[PDB]
Amino acid sequence: RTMSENLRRNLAALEAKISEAKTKKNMLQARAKAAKANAELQQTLGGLGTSSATSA
Amino acid sequence: RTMSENLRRNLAALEAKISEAKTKKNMLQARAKAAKANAELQQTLGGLGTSSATSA
């Protein structure tokens, strides 16, 4: 029973790290695509400069 | 929700600046053509000088 329960620690770790990596995949991918849009919002603050380039 | 609402600030800014630029287009064009007529009214005050040029 003693070493077997340490295998249960090990298996509990495998599922924990793998499942957490799956939620990281969602969060990071979502955050990445979102960040491309937020970067385009910074660029849209820069869009005011692109209109300025002929507003003169 | 936090960064998304900042995209709503950004989009609210895009529409605000663009729509205001559209009302500026109307006001400035109208004012420009109007000003050409008002300049012709100053010139018409000058028309009194053009008649003076043979009133002598």
| Chain B residues near residue A37 by CB distance under 8 angstroms | 7
Q: Do B7 and A47 touch (CB under 8 A)?
A: no
Q: Are B15 and A46 in contact (CB under 8 A)?
A: no
Tokens of A31: 């955050």
Return the residue matching tokens 């793998």. A18
DSSP per position, B12-38: HHHHHHHHHHHHHHHHHHHHHHHHHHH
Q: Are A44 and B14 in contact (CB under 8 A)?
A: yes
B7: how many CB neighbours lie within 10 A of its CB? Answer: 15
